[PDB]
Amino acid sequence: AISKNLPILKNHFRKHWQERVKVHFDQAGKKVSRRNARATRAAKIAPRPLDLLRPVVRAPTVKYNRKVRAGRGFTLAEVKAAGLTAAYARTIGIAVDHRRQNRNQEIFDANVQRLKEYQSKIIVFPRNGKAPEAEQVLSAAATFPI
Amino acid sequence: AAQKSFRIKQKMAKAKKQNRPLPQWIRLRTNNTIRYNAKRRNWRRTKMNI
Amino acid sequence: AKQSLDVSSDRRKARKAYFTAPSSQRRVLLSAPLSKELRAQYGIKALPIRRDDEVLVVRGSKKGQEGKISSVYRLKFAVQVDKVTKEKVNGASVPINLHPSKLVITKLHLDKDRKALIQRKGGKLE
Amino acid sequence: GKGTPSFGKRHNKSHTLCNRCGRRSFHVQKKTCSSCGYPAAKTRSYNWGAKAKRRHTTGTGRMRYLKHVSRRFKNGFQTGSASKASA
Amino acid sequence: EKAGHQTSAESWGTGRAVARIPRVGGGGTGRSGQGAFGNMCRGGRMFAPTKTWRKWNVKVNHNEKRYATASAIAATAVASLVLARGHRVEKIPEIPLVVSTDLESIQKTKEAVAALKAVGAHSDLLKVLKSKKLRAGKGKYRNRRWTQRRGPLVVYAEDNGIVKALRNVPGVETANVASLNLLQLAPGAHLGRFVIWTEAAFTKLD
Amino acid sequence: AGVKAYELRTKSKEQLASQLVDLKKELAELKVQKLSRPSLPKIKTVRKSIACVLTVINEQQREAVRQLYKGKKYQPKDLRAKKTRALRRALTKFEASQVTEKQRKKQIAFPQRKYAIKA
RNA sequence: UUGACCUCAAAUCAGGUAGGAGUACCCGCUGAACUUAAGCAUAUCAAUAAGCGGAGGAAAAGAAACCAACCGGGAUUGC
RNA sequence: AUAUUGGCGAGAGACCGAUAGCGAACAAGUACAGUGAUGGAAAGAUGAAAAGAACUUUGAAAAGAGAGUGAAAAAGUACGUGAAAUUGUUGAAAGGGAAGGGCAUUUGAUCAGACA
RNA sequence: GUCGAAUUUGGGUAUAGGGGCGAAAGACUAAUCGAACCAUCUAGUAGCUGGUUCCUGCCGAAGUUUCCCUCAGGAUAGCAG
RNA sequence: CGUGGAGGUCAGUGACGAAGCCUAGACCGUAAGGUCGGGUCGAACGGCCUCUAGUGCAGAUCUUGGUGGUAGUAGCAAAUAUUCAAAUGAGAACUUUGAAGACUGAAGUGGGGAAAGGUUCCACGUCAACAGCAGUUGGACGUGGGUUAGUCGAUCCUAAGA
RNA sequence: AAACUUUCAACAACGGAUCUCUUGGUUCUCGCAUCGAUGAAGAACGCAGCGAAAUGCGAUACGUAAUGUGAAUUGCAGAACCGUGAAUCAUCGAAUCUUUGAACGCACAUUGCGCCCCUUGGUAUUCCAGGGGGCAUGCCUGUUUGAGCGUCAUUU
Ligand SMILES: CN[C@@H]1[C@@H](O)[C@@H](O[C@@H]2[C@@H](O)[C@H](O[C@H]3O[C@H](CN)CC[C@H]3N)[C@@H](N)C[C@H]2N)OC[C@]1(C)O
Ligand SMILES: CN[C@@H]1[C@@H](O)[C@@H](O[C@@H]2[C@@H](O)[C@H](O[C@H]3O[C@H](CN)CC[C@H]3N)[C@@H](N)C[C@H]2N)OC[C@]1(C)O
Ligand SMILES: CN[C@@H]1[C@@H](O)[C@@H](O[C@@H]2[C@@H](O)[C@H](O[C@H]3O[C@H](CN)CC[C@H]3N)[C@@H](N)C[C@H]2N)OC[C@]1(C)O
Ligand SMILES: [Mg+2]
Ligand SMILES: [Mg+2]
Ligand SMILES: [Mg+2]
Ligand SMILES: [Mg+2]
Ligand SMILES: [Mg+2]
Ligand SMILES: [Mg+2]
Ligand SMILES: [Mg+2]
Ligand SMILES: [Mg+2]
Ligand SMILES: [Mg+2]
Ligand SMILES: [Mg+2]
Ligand SMILES: [Mg+2]
Ligand SMILES: [Mg+2]
Ligand SMILES: [Mg+2]
Ligand SMILES: [Mg+2]
Ligand SMILES: [Mg+2]
Ligand SMILES: [Mg+2]
Ligand SMILES: [Mg+2]
Ligand SMILES: [Mg+2]
Ligand SMILES: [Mg+2]
Ligand SMILES: [Mg+2]
Ligand SMILES: [Mg+2]
Ligand SMILES: [Mg+2]
Ligand SMILES: [Mg+2]
Ligand SMILES: [Mg+2]
Ligand SMILES: [Mg+2]
Ligand SMILES: [Mg+2]
Ligand SMILES: [Mg+2]
Ligand SMILES: [Mg+2]
Ligand SMILES: [Mg+2]
Ligand SMILES: [Mg+2]
Ligand SMILES: [Mg+2]
Ligand SMILES: [Mg+2]
Ligand SMILES: [Mg+2]
Ligand SMILES: [Mg+2]
Ligand SMILES: [Mg+2]
Ligand SMILES: [Mg+2]
Ligand SMILES: [Mg+2]
Ligand SMILES: [Mg+2]
Ligand SMILES: [Mg+2]
Ligand SMILES: [Mg+2]
Ligand SMILES: [Mg+2]
Ligand SMILES: [Mg+2]
Ligand SMILES: [Mg+2]
Ligand SMILES: [Mg+2]
Ligand SMILES: [Mg+2]
Ligand SMILES: [Mg+2]
Ligand SMILES: [Mg+2]
Ligand SMILES: [Mg+2]
Ligand SMILES: [Mg+2]
Ligand SMILES: [Mg+2]
Ligand SMILES: [Mg+2]
Ligand SMILES: [Mg+2]
Ligand SMILES: [Mg+2]
Ligand SMILES: [Mg+2]
Ligand SMILES: [Mg+2]
Ligand SMILES: [Mg+2]
Ligand SMILES: [Mg+2]
Ligand SMILES: [Mg+2]
Ligand SMILES: [Mg+2]
Ligand SMILES: [Mg+2]
Ligand SMILES: [Mg+2]
Ligand SMILES: [Mg+2]
Ligand SMILES: [Mg+2]
Ligand SMILES: [Mg+2]
Ligand SMILES: [Mg+2]
Ligand SMILES: [Mg+2]
Ligand SMILES: [Mg+2]
Ligand SMILES: [Mg+2]
Ligand SMILES: [Mg+2]
Ligand SMILES: [Mg+2]
Ligand SMILES: [Mg+2]
Ligand SMILES: [Mg+2]
Ligand SMILES: [Mg+2]
Ligand SMILES: [Mg+2]
Ligand SMILES: [Mg+2]
Ligand SMILES: [Mg+2]
Ligand SMILES: [Mg+2]
Ligand SMILES: [Mg+2]
Ligand SMILES: [Mg+2]
Ligand SMILES: [Mg+2]
Ligand SMILES: [Mg+2]
Ligand SMILES: [Mg+2]
Ligand SMILES: [Mg+2]
Ligand SMILES: [Mg+2]
Ligand SMILES: [Mg+2]
Ligand SMILES: [Mg+2]
Ligand SMILES: [Mg+2]
Ligand SMILES: [Mg+2]
Ligand SMILES: [Mg+2]
Ligand SMILES: [Mg+2]
Ligand SMILES: [Mg+2]
Ligand SMILES: [Mg+2]
Ligand SMILES: [Mg+2]
Ligand SMILES: [Mg+2]
Ligand SMILES: [Mg+2]
Ligand SMILES: [Mg+2]
Ligand SMILES: [Mg+2]
Ligand SMILES: [Mg+2]
Ligand SMILES: [Mg+2]
Ligand SMILES: [Mg+2]
Ligand SMILES: [Mg+2]
Ligand SMILES: [Mg+2]
Ligand SMILES: [Mg+2]
Ligand SMILES: [Mg+2]
Ligand SMILES: [Mg+2]
Ligand SMILES: [Mg+2]
Ligand SMILES: [Mg+2]
Ligand SMILES: [Mg+2]
Ligand SMILES: [Mg+2]
Ligand SMILES: [Mg+2]
Ligand SMILES: [Mg+2]
Ligand SMILES: [Mg+2]
Ligand SMILES: [Mg+2]
Ligand SMILES: [Mg+2]
Ligand SMILES: [Mg+2]
Ligand SMILES: [Mg+2]
Ligand SMILES: [Mg+2]
Ligand SMILES: [Mg+2]
Ligand SMILES: [Mg+2]
Ligand SMILES: [Mg+2]
Ligand SMILES: [Mg+2]
Ligand SMILES: [Mg+2]
Ligand SMILES: [Mg+2]
Ligand SMILES: [Mg+2]
Ligand SMILES: [Mg+2]
Ligand SMILES: [Mg+2]
Ligand SMILES: [Mg+2]
Ligand SMILES: [Mg+2]
Ligand SMILES: [Mg+2]
Ligand SMILES: [Mg+2]
Ligand SMILES: [Mg+2]
Ligand SMILES: [Mg+2]
Ligand SMILES: [Mg+2]
Ligand SMILES: [Mg+2]
Ligand SMILES: [Mg+2]
Ligand SMILES: [Mg+2]
Ligand SMILES: [Mg+2]
Ligand SMILES: [Zn+2]
Incomplete structure (x- = not known):
């Protein structure tokens, strides 16, 4: 069971592995099934953007600290510095994360600016009548990249 | 047996009724595939198992 | 070809669909064409x-x-005409089964409903 | 001895007909059906028994009720009745 | 996978004068006492039973794919290949055939079929319909019943309705220039398909 | 011939119960005929009618007792909705949508606001 | 003498509810040996088969007693 | 978002093609076996249409021989095609304790091509 | 051999698989007993036995070295394509 | 070389006969094989370039089904036993009736029951199969008829036990 | 020389290969979320002018009500339209739904055996028979009704 000059392999199929095979035949099937169910949210969701506004964030560790990507939510500190309540900023399609903290002025500054730029680029439909028909934009993060 | 539970007698009644050949007019029906009654039964051939 | 995702080109599903179709579905299968006139x-x-x-055959x-x-x-997917017959060698006679798609209608039988159906299809009715 | 002559001795029922499954798996003395498990509150089945499962599960019977459920649901369990149209 | 193993049979073992494949239990049915499980047995499981995890799709390098189509396109010129491929092009004006962008807007089969015929596609449009045959094989159970040749590929730039116009004429296929399908450009991996380029299309090429 | 449904649903409770004994009595006479005769398909239609009579007789007394029980808690099970055993236990539309006093004030002050972007 | 209170019962009391079925997928319990190791006991098969309890259209999980060690990240599940 | 060899409804395949494919394309979990738990088959195709063979005749009859129907009975409810083993008749040839085989030729049978 | 008793016997009833029952034979426990029968784990493992399906062309072996709870097997070198 | 299927092609072959089967008939190949004639038949099928695999059998005490020689053979010989006439029928060693010869010899080959079977009972019809000869006979086939309780049983009671 | 044997062919046997068929199976994908004490799954036994079975059904029994279609059903017999109407039709919302089964008055190798309310009958609250409606268990909220020197006040 050991012969010629070959790497040792550790080929792990000693359980009943044929039971736990998972093949994706639905790769295509599910891409469609989830494309409809996206565009059927874009309707039921009304002119709303289909996603939530996300913060600038410095990536962890030493490998990715060099970079930055969208974080979860906006830090009550920034929600107040941009001048709105959190509980309201939830319903403006801003994501607010209460766990995040600001140790960085440069990131805190960057994120407040990103917040006002959104308040400026949005139109909030009033409680009752009107609705000056607004033609929904499909992303937020595309409008507001990083 | 020959002092019978009616339960046993009744299964034994239903026995007799299935014991007749094909009614031969079914043979005539359109589409009809049944040549003969292939579920037939004999007292001394095969037994009823109560 | 079929563009609807609810239509089936499956030869098997069709052949069963046909032979299983009930009375009410068969009448519409048993359409015959109207005469040129x-x-x-x-x-x-x-x-x-x-x-x-x-x-008219x-x-x-x-x-x-x-004939009429x-x-x-x-049941047989067949239409019988009373004129057309075969005589057996016992001298009796038996209907000939005919398929409407191989017939053509000279004279409708008109009902209130048969009349309704024609106008309901956008017809004329003499 | 253990053969055919000893077979002349067999006239006694270990099992009569089970009321629940109508089988003759109902052990007279144990008074419990070796097939469906009656008297037991539940119905005897086992996972090494796939065939006998298949022989008895829902659908081997009339489905005197369950037949129609799938239809009643398609219609959202309409109550009342239907009115009229034409012809 | 359940199939063929659906008995309880087991070998009778040697000494009973018959071979040792597993054998069905019980009696009275005549299935009993018969070779079971065996890849040589009536009813037994087949050797190496087929699996859904067989490798079906095949990966190709993107650039290799594009190289292929590229070479296939270049053969829609080069008349001999198009001729050698079927495709009765011996009388058409020139290779490649480029056609007025107005084609893209045709709404009606008769209209479009004309334009095709007009511009040299008659003999090819007609090569199909003569080429219709019943499937030689057993696939004709399986919802491929009919053999036929392949007619021209009408490559438009924007589709204004040429596409629903040609979809019912046989052997004819329509495709955008932004997409292009090697399956059509080189059918059965044979070079030189017959392509009718709307002049719109032709300049989107470069 | 043989009985019509809507012509029964007119008649009085005491007429129907009488015409029932008719059809039974007609059917009884036909039963005695049928063993003297090589076949008697007639019996099919009398006894199919003894059903149709009985359907209506029952139809009434149900839609009768259905009426006096109308619009009150606790009426009898077979006049109670069938639905599904599991739907029968569902939380009613009222007690699902029952919201919280604390939470009610918040849905009010802070509802999801319609909105869009690009301008 | 009476009337409470607490606890405990009884009614074919008023009305509800649980059982069983199915069990591919799901939450748990319990639980092998064949086998592999060219022997074999730890180990492996496998926290698998079998047995048992409990669900739903999904179940479960979930808004950190988290991960990190960074300029930090930020419920859960999935690829 | 994730799972799904159960359910209900659909669409499909470089799948199998009646010893294949689920065990079951058929009155299949049927017939049948076993005290019981359980075990568990075989078996699709006349024809477009019964037109399923009037009638005569031989026979106790089953049938046969005719006649007839049919595009075909070289399709007759033993029913598409109908191989092999193996069997009857007929024809041909040969055989002193096997049969068959190889090179070669006589003899017979048989088949060309090929002259012009 | 025995034959009026530790007799024969029906039926009911109890005991169930490392269990039963045994006036003891490893006997009997449904033609199964020095561990029943049914199904499943299970396509259990086999250094051992048997088989392993078309044609032609060219090349063409080894039973020896070292190691192995190795001596009917492998590893290794050699010969071979 | 050959097989199932797949993309392409020859605008391939075919109800004026595809496929298959038959054929000490013909031809090409060293060979796997390929082509042709004739016969039978009835509805689909081939050449080429490629794609693909559940792709080729003489064996495995291989699986399933079918069939031989054995072979008109081994045999159909325990339980004393059969014989005459008539009837019936196409047909009688076997059915029916009469006559006779015998047996079981009331610890029965008699007269009933329990368990078990399940209609075998009984009448009419009736012989393809069954009754290892036969068949006019039958426990067979067909078709009908038949099981009558305050007192006989169950039901009630309790036994071991559950 | 025959027979017999063997070999080849034709015809005919035997068997059911091959070929071609396919309302089946198999695999993939998509959508959906609905069993039951309001009695399910499952059983048994019934039901048709002429049925053994498969299928359908439940003593209203191959079906009743409702709705749609617009003339059948068909194997025979039988019945039978310019219409509240054919059909072994479609659909289905209303019912019937035997003996059962978690299975519920008790039992059940028994068509065994009680109790309660209404009602008819034989002189009949009491006995006999018919008709109908009823009595399982655990638990919960509640209602009556109680128990205990467990304990509170109060009467005299
Ligand atoms: C070779 N293909 C055959 C095909 O020829 C045909 O075979 C029939 C066969 O089904 C018939 O038999 C059929 O009907 C019989 C009625 N008595 C009973 C047996 C049943 N299989 C046989 N009588 C004649 C064959 N040629 O049907 C079956 C099949 C296997 O497809
Ligand atoms: C095909 N028929 C053959 C028939 O041809 C013949 O066959 C002979 C056979 O008898 C001879 O066999 C004998 O007779 C020879 C002459 N006396 C001497 C050798 C001896 N074995 C063979 N040598 C030749 C075959 N063709 O005899 C046998 C047979 C089967 O009947
Ligand atoms: C089988 N006997 C039936 C009898 O039961 C009854 O049958 C009716 C049938 O006439 C109805 O038919 C009616 O239904 C249509 C509903 N819009 C209206 C016209 C009519 N075809 C069926 N829909 C329902 C059956 N129960 O009426 C006719 C009849 C022949 O007497
Ligand atoms: Mg390792
Ligand atoms: Mg599993
Ligand atoms: Mg999103
Ligand atoms: Mg932190
Ligand atoms: Mg047919
Ligand atoms: Mg037996
Ligand atoms: Mg038995
Ligand atoms: Mg059919
Ligand atoms: Mg026809
Ligand atoms: Mg015609
Ligand atoms: Mg035995
Ligand atoms: Mg005994
Ligand atoms: Mg016992
Ligand atoms: Mg079903
Ligand atoms: Mg398996
Ligand atoms: Mg498996
Ligand atoms: Mg086994
Ligand atoms: Mg197994
Ligand atoms: Mg074993
Ligand atoms: Mg063994
Ligand atoms: Mg031997
Ligand atoms: Mg068994
Ligand atoms: Mg198989
Ligand atoms: Mg054509
Ligand atoms: Mg083929
Ligand atoms: Mg009490
Ligand atoms: Mg209560
Ligand atoms: Mg449960
Ligand atoms: Mg269960
Ligand atoms: Mg294993
Ligand atoms: Mg080991
Ligand atoms: Mg080993
Ligand atoms: Mg060992
Ligand atoms: Mg398990
Ligand atoms: Mg979901
Ligand atoms: Mg949850
Ligand atoms: Mg996290
Ligand atoms: Mg994760
Ligand atoms: Mg994914
Ligand atoms: Mg899946
Ligand atoms: Mg076959
Ligand atoms: Mg099969
Ligand atoms: Mg085959
Ligand atoms: Mg195969
Ligand atoms: Mg099979
Ligand atoms: Mg059949
Ligand atoms: Mg059958
Ligand atoms: Mg055929
Ligand atoms: Mg067919
Ligand atoms: Mg046909
Ligand atoms: Mg004759
Ligand atoms: Mg003749
Ligand atoms: Mg002639
Ligand atoms: Mg002729
Ligand atoms: Mg022919
Ligand atoms: Mg022939
Ligand atoms: Mg033929
Ligand atoms: Mg005939
Ligand atoms: Mg023949
Ligand atoms: Mg034939
Ligand atoms: Mg032959
Ligand atoms: Mg000869
Ligand atoms: Mg000799
Ligand atoms: Mg001699
Ligand atoms: Mg001698
Ligand atoms: Mg020799
Ligand atoms: Mg003595
Ligand atoms: Mg055990
Ligand atoms: Mg013990
Ligand atoms: Mg003893
Ligand atoms: Mg002993
Ligand atoms: Mg045994
Ligand atoms: Mg024994
Ligand atoms: Mg053992
Ligand atoms: Mg053991
Ligand atoms: Mg193996
Ligand atoms: Mg094994
Ligand atoms: Mg050499
Ligand atoms: Mg040395
Ligand atoms: Mg060695
Ligand atoms: Mg060894
Ligand atoms: Mg050896
Ligand atoms: Mg080597
Ligand atoms: Mg091939
Ligand atoms: Mg293949
Ligand atoms: Mg092709
Ligand atoms: Mg060959
Ligand atoms: Mg060749
Ligand atoms: Mg020919
Ligand atoms: Mg031919
Ligand atoms: Mg044909
Ligand atoms: Mg081809
Ligand atoms: Mg060929
Ligand atoms: Mg293979
Ligand atoms: Mg081959
Ligand atoms: Mg071969
Ligand atoms: Mg072969
Ligand atoms: Mg051999
Ligand atoms: Mg054999
Ligand atoms: Mg023989
Ligand atoms: Mg033999
Ligand atoms: Mg003889
Ligand atoms: Mg002899
Ligand atoms: Mg003698
Ligand atoms: Mg002897
Ligand atoms: Mg004797
Ligand atoms: Mg005699
Ligand atoms: Mg005498
Ligand atoms: Mg005498
Ligand atoms: Mg004597
Ligand atoms: Mg006697
Ligand atoms: Mg007999
Ligand atoms: Mg005999
Ligand atoms: Mg004998
Ligand atoms: Mg004899
Ligand atoms: Mg005879
Ligand atoms: Mg006679
Ligand atoms: Mg008798
Ligand atoms: Mg009889
Ligand atoms: Mg009595
Ligand atoms: Mg106990
Ligand atoms: Mg000889
Ligand atoms: Mg022949
Ligand atoms: Mg034959
Ligand atoms: Mg066909
Ligand atoms: Mg399919
Ligand atoms: Mg549910
Ligand atoms: Mg009845
Ligand atoms: Mg079915
Ligand atoms: Mg029916
Ligand atoms: Mg219907
Ligand atoms: Mg019920
Ligand atoms: Mg019962
Ligand atoms: Mg009870
Ligand atoms: Mg009792
Ligand atoms: Mg009463
Ligand atoms: Mg009662
Ligand atoms: Zn049972």
């Missing part, structure tokens, strides 16, 4: 056949014969 009269190409209709051995349809035999 009857097409222009009613403005309709074809209708599901009916018992007392009059009809346009295909087969009996092509050129015509004795029965529509739905």
